Symmetry: C3
Subunit: 413 residues, 3 copies
Amino acid sequence: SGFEFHGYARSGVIMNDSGASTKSGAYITPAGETGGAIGRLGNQADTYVEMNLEHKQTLDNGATTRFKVMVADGQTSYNDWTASTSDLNVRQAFVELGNLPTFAGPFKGSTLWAGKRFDRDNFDIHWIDSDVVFLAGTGGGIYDVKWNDGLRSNFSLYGRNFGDIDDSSNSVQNYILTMNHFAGPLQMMVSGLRAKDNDERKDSNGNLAKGDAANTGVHALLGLHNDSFYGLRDGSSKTALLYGHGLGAEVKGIGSDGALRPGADTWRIASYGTTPLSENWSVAPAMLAQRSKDRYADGDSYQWATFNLRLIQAINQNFALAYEGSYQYMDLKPEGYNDRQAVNGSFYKLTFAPTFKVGSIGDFFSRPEIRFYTSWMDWSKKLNNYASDDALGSDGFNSGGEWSFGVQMETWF
Amino acid sequence: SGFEFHGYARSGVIMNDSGASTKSGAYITPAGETGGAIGRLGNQADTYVEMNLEHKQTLDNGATTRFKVMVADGQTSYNDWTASTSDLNVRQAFVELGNLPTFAGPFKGSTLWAGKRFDRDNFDIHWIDSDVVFLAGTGGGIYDVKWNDGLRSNFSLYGRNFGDIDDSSNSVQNYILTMNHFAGPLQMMVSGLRAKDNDERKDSNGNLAKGDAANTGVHALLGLHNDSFYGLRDGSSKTALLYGHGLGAEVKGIGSDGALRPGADTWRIASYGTTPLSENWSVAPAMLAQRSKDRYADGDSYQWATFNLRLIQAINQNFALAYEGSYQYMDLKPEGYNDRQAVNGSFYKLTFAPTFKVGSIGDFFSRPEIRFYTSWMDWSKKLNNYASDDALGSDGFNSGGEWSFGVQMETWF
Amino acid sequence: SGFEFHGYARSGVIMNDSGASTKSGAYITPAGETGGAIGRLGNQADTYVEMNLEHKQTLDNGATTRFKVMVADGQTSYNDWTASTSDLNVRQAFVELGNLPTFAGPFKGSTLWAGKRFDRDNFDIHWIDSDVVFLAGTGGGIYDVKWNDGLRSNFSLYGRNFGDIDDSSNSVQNYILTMNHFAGPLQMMVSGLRAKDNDERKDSNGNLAKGDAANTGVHALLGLHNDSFYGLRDGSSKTALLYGHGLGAEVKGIGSDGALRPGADTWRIASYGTTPLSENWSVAPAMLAQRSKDRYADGDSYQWATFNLRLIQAINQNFALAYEGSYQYMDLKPEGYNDRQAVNGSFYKLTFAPTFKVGSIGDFFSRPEIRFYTSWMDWSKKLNNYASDDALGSDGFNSGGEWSFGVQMETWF
Ligand SMILES: OC[C@H]1O[C@@](CO)(O[C@H]2O[C@H](CO)[C@@H](O)[C@H](O)[C@H]2O)[C@@H](O)[C@@H]1O
Ligand SMILES: OC[C@H]1O[C@@](CO)(O[C@H]2O[C@H](CO)[C@@H](O)[C@H](O)[C@H]2O)[C@@H](O)[C@@H]1O
Ligand SMILES: OC[C@H]1O[C@@](CO)(O[C@H]2O[C@H](CO)[C@@H](O)[C@H](O)[C@H]2O)[C@@H](O)[C@@H]1O
Ligand SMILES: OC[C@H]1O[C@@](CO)(O[C@H]2O[C@H](CO)[C@@H](O)[C@H](O)[C@H]2O)[C@@H](O)[C@@H]1O
Ligand SMILES: OC[C@H]1O[C@@](CO)(O[C@H]2O[C@H](CO)[C@@H](O)[C@H](O)[C@H]2O)[C@@H](O)[C@@H]1O
Ligand SMILES: OC[C@H]1O[C@@](CO)(O[C@H]2O[C@H](CO)[C@@H](O)[C@H](O)[C@H]2O)[C@@H](O)[C@@H]1O
Ligand SMILES: [Ca+2]
Ligand SMILES: [Ca+2]
Ligand SMILES: [Ca+2]
């Protein structure tokens, strides 16, 4: 065949009760810095776009060829001309050679790839704008090596960079070796990471950028992909247990954190489900919790847990009422790192969003959708103290209740 | 259906009688700073490109779905690699849900939209590179609410930003509420603008960026869309009378000027027509005049009137001779704002441009076209004094007559 | 017709025997600064992408219409988000009017164009990532003016810029006039270049950027396009003899070098061939040699010669073994320019690269291909002294043997 255009786009407005700007984002809480994402409905004011241009090809012998480029940009500005603050950048550029006649045995229907890409098998928890696992970078590998006709595996090498790619003395390559095995509903992912002399990166001045930074890492994922809402109702669900040590201590963006100590230790649990309550109501609960010790400073600790609950109610074939509630508890002990002060407390979010679409309302993933919304946000005052250049506690976002309103669209195809 | 690729692109060269650079642009005159556009033929040396990638969709029930992104860049450099000066940026990203089976009554054939976009109903005077009205930003709204079967209306909320989107104390959101009514050839547009605490934006130093800047504004447009050359000959024409106060004092780019005073008052007239003189000649006159008082400085005044005249002459089915004459009078009293000195005088432009195309020559909008040209420009010497970093009066562009030559292409599809 | 998406994309990884970064690139040798490219197989660690979006159109009368934009970006970073270092930029934007019913005689099937583009008739030596001739910029022209039914010619005007396009006193336009004639396998190209007052460009401080820089230039290309491997075996081959003086002294990127002296004199020879040794082996030898005197400093001299040899061996219908050997000699006498020290010596490169593809292996240009590789590089220690911020001699790339490994994809469609 030929060309295909795919992509994602969110774009909207959010204002407080006075018709002016406020803070918003799935990562605005102090916990957000270590991955503590909260509900995103009516809580995203940026114009984010991803453009996927593809060149597919099928040969008569069954062999496939595929090329894809991803160009992305994310703007907080509402203006029609954002050249000065543009973030337009090529995120992906890779080729896939699939179903080769020459590959036999366990390599029968396997697909070889190379270039810069997001791993095909990454997966996320949509309502919280957080990936469960996100393996990206530049490299190569093979998908779907079928063993015994009931155990498939992926093997790959992904390369990333740490520090300033322009400053040779403050730049390091981080490599990741990963084997991903799938056996029915079960998934076992194991990665080995390594960035030689990461601890010896000198900044522009001549001093050590870190000194106690890790040079290696280990990462693992244990996942369960169900075809029912946790086995008790129609729907679907996914549960994943993540573990990381050293450079592997950042369990979502694998190999994306160059500041982790050798002893940085992380455990994380991601879980969510989709289930129809009635021919008009659908519910999707999700939880993300993490425990990270000795991450950036000796003796530090970052603990938080997010609970998100999205509910849609079909009224028409085109109109639905969506609701979202987020709850997050956090206890962060930064030990002076980044001028952060130890903090603990909770964050809450309530959103009511009338939604229009043409697709199946009971489907959380049917996308052309336009929504109007209102949110209420509150939190323990102590969280204001985590940072001084933070969102919580800045000018006009420190009181108890904060109200926001807006309109936005979101799609993918 | 699926994917659609649409766009615009102009690109070419302009040199003076010595084979070296000169000044060019529809906005080069002192009047240009307040909107005083002049003829653009042979007067645009940049490579400007707009790329529109769309994903349209039609459901069996008549409902439509549409997503569009616009990526643009504008370069003055003639080089094949402009990475260092690139202005590539996402101008638009929106979705439209049209003709929903669930929308009845006045909402019958209406289309709902959200995201970042240029209003569907903006319209321009092409030969002068000036929109009559340009509503753009991020928001949402609805098009074509049919009342009594002879009165359609559009309602919407558009959001924009003033100042540095990165500097929190020098950054403000400006919101625009607008109702646009159409009744046959008549159009009545009304907008309310509001940017809370615009007057309190402190620059990076700590001082007020303005102090006497407006926080609100009002804007109106009275348009007449004819199906004849001003009712006296075959063709078409449009006339619009624009008025603005406060933040609405910038009558073209609505909500785009954050330095306007509360008492800034502006009146503007836009008018043009298209008419075939014979089966081989076509003429298009256009006029843009403006009166703006107390705009940026107390007691200031900007007045100017542009007269453009584009003539084409079919010689073949592929060759045409195009001519353009521009005349502009201006009287500007800046009262010391920006180091500008009060000035008054006139500007002239004559352009002869052999043109090649495949489309209908009598049509001013059939686009694939390549043109060669020569231009002569002259103006009142006094205009050289408006500014010191101006175009008129810079090194090599201060004498009486100024000749230019070049080639350029222009399209849209 | 409508839309066409075409492009090029290379993307991969290169690491040394310690799993860390190394130097790589077809232009890393001291000779590279004056065009001395070496083998590129397994010697390109960047993610370079070119996206070509086109809008073609054919009218019933045979007349064609074509619009093309090329958007490119090149990153050395392996990361999935390169907004901070993005080089995304519009490289081309042009229109072509082909086969006009009105064009008769020698203009019969000729094609008119204008805008920013790379000349349709540029051609390169692929394995060494070097164009033989590269005419690009902004202008207009005509392709295929048929004389006597055995002599075709292209005539064109190309515009380029020297210096900082933003700094008016350090900015100059360089214009190129070129006539390119083809008579069977023979090609004769002649260009006149001129940048008025190039020698008078004052940098930001107020001093002359150069002072002894050239204002004009001359360029000539003599080429032979064969339908056999140098007339002794099946295949193909091309040989070109290039000459340049003054501004024409940079014989590849015509009009792209603003620092050349008036007496800069350059001779270059490019030649390569393609030939199948057997139904499984294919060989492609290539040579690039250059002699450049009085280039940037009076009495300077840059001489070098690159010999590249690519060999592929089909093992399957999808698996091939590719080998590449590069040899380069250089004798450079910079005469103090840029802090370079006169140097002489040779560079060697051996690369073994198992390659996967679906297309014709014996075809060096069939593209979807994924390769794994290992390279060995060594050079005369003296070359380390050419510059201090060079690649040869930097930290960890100064010893004798340097090994590298990696995987990468490369395509075009
Ligand atoms: O359809 C798969 C494809 O969609 C993207 C957006 O282009 O992700 C969106 O859709 C997913 C469902 O398949 C959601 O889980 C996700 O949150 C949403 O952004 C791609 O990332 C994915 O490849
Ligand atoms: O799939 C792309 C990739 O983008 C990230 C940012 O790294 O998230 C953006 O794109 C998603 C598309 O699926 C959106 O759902 C998300 O809202 C947006 O921020 C990744 O999380 C995702 O893997
Ligand atoms: O065809 C409508 C579409 O064309 C654009 C360029 O993409 O505007 C061009 O064509 C108009 C005629 O429809 C001209 O009036 C205008 O000056 C010209 O740039 C778009 O702006 C418009 O949506
Ligand atoms: O339509 C896009 C929008 O771009 C502006 C700049 O804001 O003008 C550019 O794009 C036009 C496309 O119609 C071109 O005709 C014009 O020459 C170019 O500068 C607006 O005026 C226009 O509405
Ligand atoms: O196929 C022509 C077209 O391909 C490009 C890449 O898009 O060049 C590639 O293919 C050429 C063979 O036709 C190679 O010689 C060249 O090295 C390779 O990059 C374009 O440059 C060319 O227009
Ligand atoms: O064809 C585009 C043009 O790009 C240059 C850089 O000016 O080279 C890049 O693009 C080529 C596409 O054919 C690639 O083959 C090449 O590897 C890449 O660096 C020119 O050499 C080429 O003419
Ligand atoms: Ca805070
Ligand atoms: Ca001046
Ligand atoms: Ca060196």
